[model samples]
Target: KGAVTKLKFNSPIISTSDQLISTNELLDRLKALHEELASLDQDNTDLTGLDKYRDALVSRKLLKHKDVGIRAFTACCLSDILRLYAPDAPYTDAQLTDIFKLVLSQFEQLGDQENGYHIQQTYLITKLLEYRSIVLLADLPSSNNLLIELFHIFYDPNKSFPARLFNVIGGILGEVISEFDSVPLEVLRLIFNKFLTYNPNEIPEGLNVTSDCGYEVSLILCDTYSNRMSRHLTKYYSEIIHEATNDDNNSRLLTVVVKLHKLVLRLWETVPELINAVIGFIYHELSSENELFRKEATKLIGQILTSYSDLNFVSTHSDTFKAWISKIADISPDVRVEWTESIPQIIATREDISKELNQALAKTFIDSDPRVRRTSVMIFNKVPVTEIWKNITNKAIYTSLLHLAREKHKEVRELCINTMAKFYSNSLNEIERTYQNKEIWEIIDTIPSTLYNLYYINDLNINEQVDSVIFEYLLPFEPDNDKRVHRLLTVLSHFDKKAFTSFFAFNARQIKISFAISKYIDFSKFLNNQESMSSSQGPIVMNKYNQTLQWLASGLSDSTKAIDALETIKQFNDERIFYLLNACVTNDIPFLTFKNCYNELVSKLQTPSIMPRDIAKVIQILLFRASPIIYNVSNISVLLNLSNNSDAKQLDLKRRILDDISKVNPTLFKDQIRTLK
Candidate 1:
């Protein structure tokens, strides 16, 4: 403390006109002050010296000096002292009043300057106000008039204090508000009237009047007053709305409207009378001729509806809400667009409102403008599938949406296709039965192509919903006719086989074939039995029983259209088929079907048109499957003949034939010994 006082007297805070100090000397003195302040003992008994040092520091006209650096330093030091020690001070109110008077007088003088001096003074006054607020908040009964008087002084335009004084008072008021259990009724009225009379432009020069400081203070005042005074704020709000509307101060009207909305929302539990006024305002705004007012009014109405949608008020005011919706249904497209955008958030937070909005949006899906119709369909896609399905199956909404899917505009058509894809994907059974004989297959089959062209050729940025819809509609079982298969094949053929293979492999998991199959048959028994096997028999047995291995492998034949499909099937080796073939070879099948098939396969292998590499692979697989029976045969002459004619470069074929013969009974091959030699 002693060192800080000495440093202040010796350096920047000292009048440079009296004695100019070197920068290095000023820095050395500041370092000493920092060390002294850091080392001070709060429990020390020798405190008189520290008090004298502090008093002398505050008494200096250092802040009045011409140099900004000196004035700012002095203000900062005083602020620090008041912050750290004011709570423990011994001064009476009279003594403290005298000190504050001097301090505020200095602030008034410094505030006259337009430069950094004003800024420094403002900083000091802010800290002093903060100190006053904290000390006086607990003793409000005795401090109210004084605080209010100080606030008026700070706000007085005639005074020379900086504009920052208003900001400081606002900040202090916000901090001290919580000390009052409730705002006194009269005090609340006074504060609000003051706020009403406040020139927002001069509230704080260059300060953002719209910021949280003013808003928070207003909210606290409203909540406290409304809760304690029993609907006084509500009545005041009603009158403001009435006057603002009557006088046509639309700008101020909008501001007051937003504030009223916030206030009513905050105090809705304690005060319920304000809700009707909000709804009335909403109806009027929805019908207003002014575009800007209508836009903001609709937004505010959406907010209120969203906030209180779950309450009985929604249903009670259903007629009014419906009237509002009808009036604004065909309003300026921009307003409708903004309202449409806000609908989702409102629906998401409030269930009853969502239900009402969903129904309304379903009707709007056929709007004349393609953009509005598209947005409506897009929103439909986001509606919870359960809710939509219930409405579609039980009501006419589904049919209406499907009708929109056949629209002329590309965007509307695309949104309809995408949304219905989600719907069918979610409720395939319900849709397949309902639209089974319709053009459902044709509609679904065109989705992927439509999306691809829209995204790649037409340059539409496909969202995830669009991609997801495309993927769902393209599943193998979704299409009932061969034309869909042909179209898929055509699309797949356009891409490289490898790329198509990777694409199919990545998205194959998203396909839901079982659900599609269930639409045609009562697969309940199969599903239930499958579940039992899955639980008791474990994954291995259940998988083997449910194996699609042979069916998949069969699709890989030469005539298949898509290499992607073939590659996807080829990922799983036909272990189940190999096991079946082993059983057939061992058993005596009726009429020797297995032997006949094996002979025919060998003939195909020997054909000149067949690629030797492919022939070798088939031969190896068949030989492994039929080994127990074919190994001991004496009529292996045909195999020997075919092996002998193979090209020298066909080493894989030679290897397979040798492996098969080596595993066979040696006695059975004794007749071919000379050819082997």
Candidate 2:
């Protein structure tokens, strides 16, 4: 540590007329004092008479002195005086603005990094920030313009600066901005320009000098006034959003608008608290009349949603969420395509977004532009199956996929069918066949039949995808005989005559001897025989078998739409052949009476028939028998075990049984654990 020293300094006595000195003499005296102050360790030095020295310096009027060195040294000495007395600058706001202007003017020359006054000005800037006297400039009327010039001067690429000076200037700007409620729009723009330029998409073998300086200042500013400056920056960019599209110089303004928007998005992590402002600006752009802006905004918003989905600001911002979804139906097909392209990732990450976004995606299925529809199809296929199933409650989405099975574009139809096949596959895996899941199940169960109906489209692409759907997803491929039998039976039981007939006919070339329908029928007989073997042993197994058979038989009794299927079957036998009946069943089959037909044909099968229509009828009936049944309903072990019935209903009944015992022993009931409110 250096020994402490108290400097003896004499001020020019500005109170007396005879004591007046020439400007050169005054500057020489100020220079001597400035050099003495710069060399002393600020922490250990005593300057008891500094007020008079500052008073004489202020009185000298050398702030705008003709000699640059004298004015620079005067500002430097004043800066040290302000720092030594910290949080309190002796000058008025206006004078402080001017003094810093001189201080900033000195910074302008330090850009060369080797100038003589560089160290003098550098130490002056550092002391101002180290004691935070720089914050005083924020209250000055010229603070905004001063900040603009300061940023520009510091960021000048033509000049060179050291990393140490860059950090000091950055911290200085940060402190100034922190003292204000808001910063100037021009200053924000200048900082953003530096922000964007320094933050290039590519980088780094060590760091570029100007690049680091530019980035450091922005980082400091954002970290200081994140909420304030972000709101201001968002407002500035929002004005740019509306200014671009109508002018003769449209492209240039569009470029500016686009870049400014992207600047806010990149700074999300830095200024995350103001993301709502960013989201509001995106909502405006999504609603912009300019197609290009809307398109870019749609894509950009998707990026924000995908990247910032973990933050509530992006998802919970209601208007932007709706506006983003609404872009799927945007006036421009290009905009719709852009919106569609982002759906898969958006939906993938954002699970809480229910039918609103999914419904928008569903509508894109029939978008007039094939490109939109094509992208929509791929999005549907790529998105998680449960998200689609949970959100899309309409059969029309499925119908659209089917109709697109005949879409004029081969790529679109192929994509549509593949998505249909995927949905169908997912349904089978989910395998929920309860009244609660009935809506989605009803829509999903018919995809196989609808795909079969597409066989008549005669479009080779549609036909191939249909065949692949049947071969890959609908048919059983399991190695377990019982699993294969159960799957094949359930699938075939639901198929209508056309679907059944078409599937069998198509697989004639695709099947092996092991896959022949007759072999499965024979296998079903062996399974029945195993049940008989179990039944012969005791009433335990026999009753379990009987209960399973009874449960399977119970569904046929609940049949409500039997008449519709009867009418459909009657139409097939009419002498007046098919008319709109062809068109009617083309969309969906009326298979409600499948149980009755299946029962009738089974009785007739006991006598056997060679009639072609009867054989087709028998095939459909057999498939109808394959309808799935509930499991574990009558297991002998569960039935015999009392604990298996320990559900709430039985428990409540047992509690009532205890009431009788309590009634017989009133005192015992009173002594037992019962309390009143």
List TM-scores for all candidates, in order.
0.35, 0.57
Best by TM-score: 2
Model 2: residue 608 alpha-carbon error in angstroms: 54
- Per-residue lDDT tens digits for candidate 1, residues 1-677, read 33333222223423267786665454355344434543344444234444544654454454344545554544445444545564666444554454454454544555455754455455556665655624433343445554454434434445454334445545555455444544344344445544444333455556563432333344444444334334445455667677777775656777767666555554443234435545565666667787766776666656666554335555656755675466336567766766666555555555554455655666566566666666666655676654443332313445556666445566777667777665554553343434533433443333343444433332222333344455455432223333433333433333433443333332332122222212212221234334555466566643543343223233223323222322332333343433333334442243245455554544543543324445334333323322332122322422344345555433443343345445434575476777788
Q: Write the per-residue lDDT of candidate 2 for residues 1-677, one digit (tens) a residue.
A: 23367666665624357667676776677778887766656567665656677666565467666666676677778877776655445677766776878878777877865645666677778877887777777778888778778777877777667777767877887777776666666676677776567655466655543356767767766766565666666666765555664557846776886786677667664555566666666678788877987988887777776665235643457667777887777889999988888878877776666667647766887788899888866765787777766555565666677778766787877777777777677777774666766765655667777778786655543554565456466753333434543454445444677875575444332222213233322222333334555455455644443333333223232222322333233333432222222211221122333224434544543442123344333233323223321111212222233455545543343333233323433674465467642
Model 1, backbone clash pairs (residues 3+ apart or across chains), number: 0
Assess candidate 2 and give its TM-score to the true structure: 0.57
Model 1 scores a C-alpha lDDT of 0.47
Best by lDDT: 2
Angstrom error at residue 311, model 1: 5.1
Q: Residue-pair clashes per candidate, as listed?
A: 0, 2
In candidate 2 the C-alpha lDDT for residue 489 amounts to: 44
Model 2 CA RMSD to the hidden true structure, in angstroms: 19.5
